[PDB]
Each structure stands twice: as C-alpha cells, then as structure tokens.
C-alpha cells in the first residue's frame, strides 16, 4: 500500500554500489567473453542488433533508463537515433560514463563489445567509427529515479516524449517487489510517445547480486510476469525471449537463473 | 642482397602497416582491399588443402588471416633472420610483438562468419608450424632437406618477388623457382607493388623492379599458371607517403596447370 520504506531500503543499499566491481562481475570474462556465441554477452548484443535491423525501431530521440556504468546497450541503437539521453540514479555511475565519453584511458574498455556489435551488424563498420558515433549521439547524462511519477524530475532537459526507450537490468534490480516493479514500468512509460518502442532486458528469477561491498536485493520475476506487466502498462509485446544461464556463467555474483529480452511497442 | 642487410623490420611495419596505410576504417584504403582479395578468394572454397607456404613473409602475418582456416599446416618464410625473429615474437605472444589485432578484427568483419578476432589469431598461431629461411633466387629456394612438407597444396607471397629482383627476368626466374614448391593443380595467391622502383626500411633503401599488370600476367603464364583472377588497386594520393613510389597494388590468383 505504501512504497517509501522499500524504496528507502533500495536507495540505502545502492549507496554502497561499486561500479568497477559491477563491471568486472558482469562485463569482464567469463560473462564478458564475447568469443563464445552461446554466452550471455553475445546473446544480448544479438537481441539488440536483430531488433534494430528490422528498421522498425527509429526516430529522433532515445532515452536509456538506468544506464549504470555501461554502454553496450546502445551500440546497435546509436545508428538509429540523433539524440540519446543516458541516465542513472548514482552520481558515481554518471562519472564512470563521463570517463568513457571523454575517451579517457582510465575508463572501462568497451572496445571488444563495440567490435562484436560491428561484427554482427555486418555492415563492415570499424569499431572506432561506431564508438565515435555513440559519443556524438549522447546529448546528456541525467539523474533518474524510476519510483518517482516523473522519473527525470519536473521540466527536465530531456526531449519529451522520446521515440524510444532502452532499459537493461534496471527495473527488477531497484524494485523491492512486483507491485513496485509495475509502477516503475508505469512511470518510465510516461516518457515514451504513443506508438514508440521499448527494449527491455533484465534478470529472471533473481533475488540478489553483488557490487563490491554492497549485496543488493532484486524482485525475482518470471517471463510471464514481465509480459503481464508490459500489457498492464499499455504495450503490445512484439518480442519476448529468454536466455537460460549456463552453469559456468553462474559465478556467485548473483542468483540469476536467466535473462529476458522484450521488444514492446506503446499503444496509442 | 647486401641491401637487405640494413633492413629494419619496425621501420617497414611502421611505413606500411601503421596509419595512414594501416588505418583499416576507410574501406577505400589499401589495407581493406588486400584483406578483401584474400578473403574473397578463400570464400570460393576452391583453394583448399592440407599444407601451405608463405614466401617472403617478412615481419607480417595479415596475408594468412583468411588463409589459416583452410590449411592445417602452415610454413612461413623469410630471407632475413631479424624478420624471422619479429614473427616469432608475435607467434609466441612475446613482449614487443607487433599488434596485428586491427587486421584480425577486419578479417573477421570481412569474412562475416561471426568469428571473434581472438579465435582467428589463435587458429593462425596454432596452424603456423614453422618459420624457415628462404632465398627465391635459389632453384630449391628452401634448400636440400627442408622441414617443410613438399609439395605444398598452395602458396602465398606478398610484396616479395618484385622487391628482391633487379629486373623482369630476375623476377621471372624467381617465380619459376618458387613454382617448383607447388604441387601441380595447386594454387598461388600473389600480391605485389605495381610500377614501384624503390622503398625504404629505416636505414635500408631497397630497389624494386617496376612491373605492370600485363607483365605480371605474362609471367604467371610462362611459369605454367592458369590466371584465375588478377585485380589492381590504384594508389590514392593520400597514401603516397614518401616511403616509396608504389603506383598501385596487384592481386593475382593463379593455378599451376
Ligand atoms: N530508484 C532508481 N531509479 C532509476 N535507476 C536506479 C534507481 N536505483 C538504482 N538505479 C540504478 O540501477 C542500476 C542497476 S545496474 C544496470 C546497468 C546497465 N543498465 C547494464 O545493463 O548493466 C544501477 O546503475 C543503479 O544505480
Ligand atoms: N633473396 C631473397 N629470397 C626470398 N625472400 C627475400 C630475399 N631478399 C629479401 N627477401 C624478403 O622479401 C621481403 C619483402 S617485404 C615483406 C613482404 C611481406 N610478405 C608483406 O606482405 O609486407 C622482406 O621480408 C625481405 O627480407
Ligand atoms: Cl548474466 C547477467 C548479465 C548482466 C547482468 N546485469 C545485472 N545482472 C546481470 C546478470
Ligand atoms: Cl601500399 C603498400 C603496401 C604494402 C607494401 N609492401 C611493400 N610495399 C608496399 C606498399
């Protein structure tokens, strides 16, 4: 009935979130081994690329929701949108992205990811061009709280409404339970134009994951629960696919059983 | 021969395989053209077999990137000790090895089989069995009883012959010599400079025989080849860099009759 406590537990916990430990855990090998095609890294990139390759998802503006310190989620996207907004709750994540944007050395190195995207998009693009294009198309990096009814604040910088939304491993990772999840989904939906698209990626049946000192709580959701929430928010589900986590990628960083990918189109 | 004694491998790599000639991002550059020729040729599935030899490899490996998934036993060669050492460093992942990874990535891009560049390099490294001395001026260019499995099912050679040959006839004999290493029905992929006469490798100033496409064709024919394919890349102004006077590059696919 009342959300404050749960939300406050969530904000408290993320106060200990360590971005480098998160990157190492989920984006360095073995999870970051893009050489095995049966691995989660290549499956993620594939979903994005295949989705954008339909040409059916385009426009001027895009908002990435809960970017964290990662950019892979925008590699295939950046060729289809002039204007990209990145976002995160945590300043320390916003700074991490700042470092990649300034092309500093001390930044996380996404080049294997960039190269792989270029590889599977099959336009023969070099990875440096791809990266240079993402850095150009990222127009701002903003604070976000998906629990607020206006997740970006009032009269925010972001072009509203966006033609498309991307969100990866955010909603379920910051929502104490399924009702919270649903509301978060409902809040971000106010940012998308009617007829626009949402690409949603996340963890299935996950209850915790590590990010350094911080052990964080996740609402474990199923595919059927994700579909239902999407429908319940005013979306037509165009695609919902599931990746089952192989034992060898279950590393003790979380209890994730699998990953879901959703392409949904806002009805209107 | 004495001219090749002053030959600095890093200065050659830097002059030809680093920017601008080594920027693989523009598809109109000489780098991408070369890899495209190699890749396209192997993708035909007609250049196949068990053993292959690369003639005058110098300190470079790119010429085998697409090849290496078609031949389980690979032999690399060069006249100079220093080049053989520079190859060693990259094969053995040693310190101060040249970084070929942009080229690996591009072969993977071009071949379009969704391969990661690390697997490509791994396979190449595994399939190169030996790096041997060679002198194409010799009738048996490899010497008497070489470690190399002869005759080979195929041959590669890039920028070697025209660059070790004073004139057309010295060039034609060199071709005749290496052609003896190639099993009849075998395949030659030959790449070289068009109408070039000199190029620099650090302190070394090397002499080259200026050859034309028609000259290259006639030579392969006279050596006993059926020219399956012969293409030319004209050298753009922006890639004419003071390190030589190459006018174009040629790629030849030939098959010993
Ligand atoms: N109340 C809130 N509203 C929106 N984002 C939040 C939030 N609380 C935490 N986050 C962000 O949720 C992210 C989960 S990590 C996901 C990182 C990136 N999307 C990738 O795909 O891996 C963290 O960056 C965290 O800071
Ligand atoms: N008499 C000879 N017989 C065989 N190779 C020779 C030779 N004299 C010089 N070479 C080698 O010919 C090479 C020319 S340059 C290296 C070409 C390399 N394959 C690439 O594609 O760039 C040098 O490595 C040089 O040392
Ligand atoms: Cl397997 C996997 C991949 C990425 C993730 N981000 C958060 N949890 C994850 C789990
Ligand atoms: Cl443009 C170019 C590329 C490779 C070469 N090797 C010898 N001369 C060259 C010239």
Dihedral of CA atoms A55, A60, A66, A70 in degrees, nearest 10, equals: 70
Joined tokens for residue B111: 């071949």
Q: How far, in Å, CA of A52 to CA of A78, rounded?
A: 10
**Has B43 been labeled as part of a binding site?**
no
**Has A93 been labeled as part of a binding site?**
yes
CA B92 → CA B11, B87, B126, B130, B224, distances in Å? 21, 9, 10, 12, 37
Cβ contact, residue pair A119, B106, below 8 Å: no
Joined tokens for residue A65: 């929701």
A131 lines ligand 1 (CB under 6 A): no
Q: How far, in Å, CA of B54 to CA of B76, rounded?
A: 5
Angle in degrees, 0-180, between the axes of helices B101-111 and A111-121, rounded to the nearest 10: 20
Sole residue written with tokens 């195929």: B154
In chain B, whose CA is at the least distance from the CA of A123?
B109
Sole residue written with tokens 């089989």: B113
Q: Which ligand is nearest to the CA of A32?
A: 3
Q: Map residue B205 onto helix, strand or coil.
A: strand
CATH 3.40.50.150 fits B1-257, yes or no: yes
Count CB neighbours of B53 within 10 A.
Answer: 30
Cβ contact, residue pair A122, B108, below 8 Å: no
Name the experiment that determined this structure.
X-ray
Q: Are A252 and A245 in contact (CB under 8 A)?
A: no
Cβ contact, residue pair B114, A124, below 8 Å: no
Cβ contact, residue pair A119, B119, below 8 Å: no
Sole residue written with tokens 């050659």: B12
**Chain A contact set for B108 (CB, 8 A):** 119
Alpha carbon of B119: minimum distance to chain A alpha carbons (Å): 7
Select the residue from B26, B107, B117 to test the A interface by mutation, using most A Cβ atoms within 10 A: B117
Q: How far, in Å, CA of B241 to CA of A224, rounded?
A: 62
> A with B: how many residue pairs have Cβ under 8 Å apart?
28
Ligand 2 centroid from CA B206, angstroms: 11
| Domain residue ranges in chain A | 1-268
**Has B112 been labeled as part of a binding site?**
no
A163 lines ligand 1 (CB under 6 A): no
Q: How far, in Å, CA of A122 to CA of B113, rounded?
A: 10
- Whether chain B has a CB inside 8 Å of the CB on A183: the answer is no
Select the residue from A32, A35, A36, A49 to test the B interface by mutation, using most B Cβ atoms within 10 A: A35
Quick one: which of A173, A170, A224 has its CA closest to A199? Answer: A170
**Chain B contact set for A120 (CB, 8 A):** 114
**Has B135 been labeled as part of a binding site?**
yes
A86 lines ligand 1 (CB under 6 A): no
Alpha carbon of B11: minimum distance to chain A alpha carbons (Å): 25
Cα–Cα–Cα angle for A231, A233, A239, rounded to 5 degrees:
45
Cα–Cα–Cα angle for A226, A230, A232, rounded to 5 degrees:
115
Ramachandran area for residue B14 (φ above 0: left; ψ -120 to 50: alpha; else beta): alpha
Closest protein CA for atom 7 of ligand 4: B159
Cα–Cα–Cα angle for B100, B62, A121, rounded to 5 degrees:
75
Q: Which residues contact B127 (CB under 8 A, 6 or more apart)?
A: B68, B71, B72, B73, B74
**Has A224 been labeled as part of a binding site?**
no
Helix (H) or strand (E) holding A40: helix A40-53
What is the DSSP annotation of A122-139? TS---HHHHHHHHHHHEE
Cα-to-chain-centroid distance, residue B12: 14
**Has B115 been labeled as part of a binding site?**
no
Q: Are A103 and A109 in contact (CB under 8 A)?
A: no
Burial B176-213 (b: 16+ CB within 10 A, else e): ebbbebbeeebbbbbbbbbbbbebbbeeeebebbbbee
A45 lines ligand 1 (CB under 6 A): no
Quickly count helices (H) and strands (E) in chain B: 7, 9
Joined tokens for residue B213: 């496409």
Count CB neighbours of A149 within 10 A.
Answer: 9
CA A119 → CA B7, B24, B44, B66, distances in Å? 37, 14, 21, 16
CA A197 → CA A57, A60, A61, A162, A165, distances in Å? 7, 12, 11, 9, 6
- Whether chain B has a CB inside 8 Å of the CB on A124: the answer is yes
Main-chain dihedrals φ then ψ at residue A132, nearest 5 degrees:
-60, -35
**Chain B contact set for A111 (CB, 8 A):** none
Q: Which ligand is nearest to the CA of A199?
A: 1
Ligand 1 centroid from CA A40, angstroms: 19
Q: Which residues line ligand 2 (CB under 6 A)?
A: B 4, 7, 56-58, 60, 63, 78-80, 83, 134-137, 158-160, 163-164
Q: How far, in Å, CA of A206 to CA of A219, rounded?
A: 7
CA A234 → CA A152, A267, B172, B190, distances in Å? 20, 6, 75, 62
Q: How far, in Å, CA of A38 to CA of A243, rounded?
A: 10
Alpha carbon of B151: minimum distance to chain A alpha carbons (Å): 35
- Whether chain B has a CB inside 8 Å of the CB on A30: the answer is no
Looking at chain A, how many residues does it have? 268
Q: Are A130 and A111 in contact (CB under 8 A)?
A: no
Residue range A1-268 forms a domain whose CATH class is: alpha beta
Sole residue written with tokens 């034992």: A247
């Amino acid at each position: 009935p009342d959300s404050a406590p749960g939300q406050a537990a969530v904000a408290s916990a993320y106060q200990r979130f360590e971005p480098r430990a998160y990157l190492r855990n989920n984006y360095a090998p073995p999870r970051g081994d893009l050489c095995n095609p049966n691995g989660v890294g290549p499956w993620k990139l594939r979903c994005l690329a295949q989705t954008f390759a339909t040409g059916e998802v385009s426009g001027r503006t895009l908002i990435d929701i809960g970017s964290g310190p990662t950019v892979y989620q925008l590699l295939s996207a950046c060729s289809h949108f002039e204007d990209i907004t990145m976002t995160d709750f945590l300043e320390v994540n916003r700074q991490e992205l700042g470092r990649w944007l300034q092309e500093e050395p001390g930044a996380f190195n996404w080049s294997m990811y960039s190269q792989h995207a270029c590889l599977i998009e099959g336009k023969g693009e070099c990875w440096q061009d791809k990266e240079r294009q993402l850095r150009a198309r990222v127009k701002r990096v903003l604070p976000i709280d998906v629990h607020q009814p206006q997740p970006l604040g009032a009269g925010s910088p972001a072009p509203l409404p966006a033609d498309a939304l991307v969100s990866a491993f955010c909603l379920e990772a910051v929502s104490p339970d399924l009702a919270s999840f649903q509301r978060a989904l409902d809040h971000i939906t106010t940012l998308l134009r009617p007829g626009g698209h949402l690409l949603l990626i996340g963890a299935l049946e996950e209850s915790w994951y590590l990010a350094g000192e911080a052990r964080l709580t996740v609402v474990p959701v199923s595919e059927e629960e994700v579909r239902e929430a999407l429908v319940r928010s005013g979306y037509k589900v165009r695609d919902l696919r599931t990746y089952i986590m192989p034992a060898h990628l279950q590393t003790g960083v979380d209890d994730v059983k699998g990953v879901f990918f959703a392409w949904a189109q806002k009805v209107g």
